[PDB]
Paper text:
[name] pseudokinases regulate cell migration, invasion and proliferation by recruiting key signaling proteins to the cytoskeleton. [name] proteins are a unique group of pseudokinase (PsK) scaffolds that can self-assemble regulatory networks. In addition to the conserved PsK and SHED domains, all [name] proteins have an N-terminal intrinsically disordered region (IDR) replete with short linear motifs (SLiMs)—conserved sequence motifs that can that form dynamically regulated docking sites to recruit interactors involved in [name] signaling. Here, we elucidate the molecular details of key [name] signaling interactions with the adapter proteins CrkII and Grb2 and the scaffold protein 14-3-3.
The second region we identified was a “tandem site” that comprises two directly adjacent motifs that were both conserved: a PRM known to bind CrkIINSH3 (consensus motif: PxLPxK); and a putative binding site for 14-3-3 proteins (mode 1 consensus motif: Rxx(pS/T)xP). We selected, as an initial subset, four human 14-3-3 isoforms (ɣ, ε, η, σ) out of the seven human isoforms, as those were most abundant in proteomic interaction analysis of [name] proteins in cells. This complex crystallized with two 14-3-3ε dimers in the asymmetric unit (ASU), each bound to a single copy of the PEAK3tandem-[name] peptide. In each symmetric 14-3-3ε dimer, the PEAK3tandem-[name] peptide is present in the peptide binding groove in an overall antiparallel arrangement, with clear unbiased electron density for the central phosphoserine residue ([name] [name]) recognized by 14-3-3ε as well as adjacent residues of the [name] motif (~7 residues in total). Notably, interactions typical of such 14-3-3 complexes are observed: the [name] [name] phosphate group is coordinated by 14-3-3ε residues K50, R57, R130 and Y131 and 14-3-3ε D127 and N176 interact to enable N176 to form a hydrogen bond to the backbone amide (–NH) of [name] L70. Each copy of the PEAK3tandem-[name] peptide within the ASU adopts a similar conformation. In each of the three 14-3-3:tandem peptide structures, no clear electron density was observed for the adjacent CrkIINSH3 PRM likely due to flexibility and crystallographic averaging. When the phosphorylated PEAK3tandem-[name] peptide was first pre-complexed with 14-3-3ɣ, binding of CrkIINSH3 was further weakened (ITC KD 3.6 µM).
Residue numbers in the entry:
A (entry chain A): -2 to 233
B (entry chain B): 2 to 234
C (entry chain E): 66 to 72
D (entry chain F): 65 to 73
The structure:
Amino acid sequence: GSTMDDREDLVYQAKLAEQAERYDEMVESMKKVAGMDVELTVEERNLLSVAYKNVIGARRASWRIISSIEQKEENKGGEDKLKMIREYRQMVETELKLICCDILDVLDKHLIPAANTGESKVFYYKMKGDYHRYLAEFATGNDRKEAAENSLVAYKAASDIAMTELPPTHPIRLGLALNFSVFYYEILNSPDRACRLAKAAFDDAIAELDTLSEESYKDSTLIMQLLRDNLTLWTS
Amino acid sequence: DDREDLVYQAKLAEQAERYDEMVESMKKVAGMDVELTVEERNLLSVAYKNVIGARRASWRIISSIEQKEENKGGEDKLKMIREYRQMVETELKLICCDILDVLDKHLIPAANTGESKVFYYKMKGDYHRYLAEFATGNDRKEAAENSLVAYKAASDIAMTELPPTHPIRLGLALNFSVFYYEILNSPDRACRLAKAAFDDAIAELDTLSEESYKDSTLIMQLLRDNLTLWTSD
Amino acid sequence: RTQSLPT
Amino acid sequence: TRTQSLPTR
């Protein structure tokens, strides 16, 4: 009956929902945990991040495909087809707004106010940056400028905490550098800053890789390879 | 136009991989009481197969977890696992009854060709088989019997309307053989059907079209794969 | 594992 | 190829 019983039961459900690949339910479970205004464990914040990422990613993929079809039809000139296409895109965009706002409110009202460690604060401000960035992906006009600003400010907050609280080889720090550089490239359309961010993050980590453990060595080197991959592509 | 718009919507939902919406569109089409084109038939089956398949995968995983926990002895974990399985099983029944209802109230009564009749009766067979996968007791016997009757009907129409190399006939033999093995627990009959379908196709392999060769040969080797595996047991 | 007709 | 963000499980 206690909140701690509820918590373990909720976390077990999320783990079931994840196994069954039913992420709508895993989101519902992990959101209930986040509402207790407590510091999440590493496991719990991971579950929550996975739950929301899968839910939003399905829509982000649907949106990209539909936009592709929309471009092709605009070139062909089929207005009636386009009326249907835009209605479809708009429906997916409404789902995107609802999902992004859902987690962003959870982050602002529950997760961030209760975060007490450097890892978790960097983690939550990075999510905030991520989900404001997803809003900016399909926003237009003023809404886009606002989403971009919210994303930038949140990533900058995450970075300010990360550079003083996490080692440069830390996977959360590296993952923050990866997504923040992608933001510079895809939202602000500043390739120079995107590269300079990726390269700096990569270089600082390579310098101190010798202190890295094992399980963190795997995750860190994998993220460093993504940073290198993005760099090679952008410099190409 | 409504039909033309409906079919275009389904093609968008398929592209977006939003299969609930694709089902919604194709279901309105099937309700029109018309002979569907091959394209519309494919759209319909793909929409429903994807909706049901997600649940079938979720059910198998949850069933697996339930077994492990039953061995371990986690009473509280098992109560939640079982509740989860029952919820997924409810979704499964609802999806199946929806398509089975559409088939009996619209598709089959309006079916106009032999292949389309085979196609719809095979769907009936499939979705009653999906019911039987998780049913128990009487519900199981009825689902299995219903599946069997639909599969036999399709076979009877196919043996007279489609050449033994026709992909729909072959796919019917594949799913029907799977039913004999997996639902009726009859490896003997399952292998006899699979091999029979394989042999009839090979005898008339010259009848295969260049286009049907890809689909048919892939199906016939699935029959061969099933045969090898079933004979392994 | 046994496999039925794909989609 | 295309840009990449942090992957999820």
